Ligand binder design. Sequence first.
Ligand SMILES: COc1ccc(C[C@H](N)C(=O)N[C@H]2[C@@H](O)[C@H](n3cnc4c(N(C)C)ncnc43)O[C@@H]2CO)cc1
Length: 232
Amino acid sequence: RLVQLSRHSIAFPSPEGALREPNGLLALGGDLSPARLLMAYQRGIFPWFSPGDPILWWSPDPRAVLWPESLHISRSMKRFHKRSPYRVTMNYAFGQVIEGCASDREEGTWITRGVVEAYHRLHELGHAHSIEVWREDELVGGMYGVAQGTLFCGESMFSRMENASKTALLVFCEEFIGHGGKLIDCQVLNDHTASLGACEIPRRDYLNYLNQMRLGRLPNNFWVPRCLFSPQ
Ligand SMILES: COc1ccc(C[C@H](N)C(=O)N[C@H]2[C@@H](O)[C@H](n3cnc4c(N(C)C)ncnc43)O[C@@H]2CO)cc1
């Protein structure tokens, strides 16, 4: 049971054979090369592990997910946004966002130099993207993830100013839906993400969605770096 990946192949074991507790633990080892990483997202698997541990790959059951249209926005958040003090941009500073998440210290601590360089390559190659939230000239939050057709896999987010990451997601969902976005993978569910409207569906359901959506498509220029929302 369980399995060590080899530097030779880039193949992964079927997600369904993953462990029950720790939920999702499927395999360890391998590397974080673009090819293997990309392969993992294709198969509905993601790497996650603390510093000093060998690479760990997961595919939990259920799976956290967020339907873009079901994003919950408090009435005070709408009030806030209507007169928002933030500027949201896309792919303006991926390196700064991932670094921001990597400092969140509650658990951005798993984002080691190696993981950071790993998703940097995916960003250069055009698979990973980031949404930045600015307060005047300072980056006060954001989120990044691996795009996959009409599905988007959230990796992490951070906030240095009140409601920052909320608007990051708010603005993202609008843009996302408006252009054919269909689902947001939230990996593992937690309090913040759950209050935002995230929910859990069966691993096999998420996997199906994955297969139907990875084939989808968004405008050929959806991810080019641009501003999505400007303050007043
Ligand atoms: C569309 O825009 C976005 C962008 C980013 C996200 C990240 C989302 N907060 C999220 O998945 N937040 C999660 C994950 O990034 C990551 N994580 C993932 N798996 C685990 C795990 N195990 C499998 C044991 N243990 C601990 N942490 C894990 O930790 C965070 C909270 O615990 C969501 C949407």
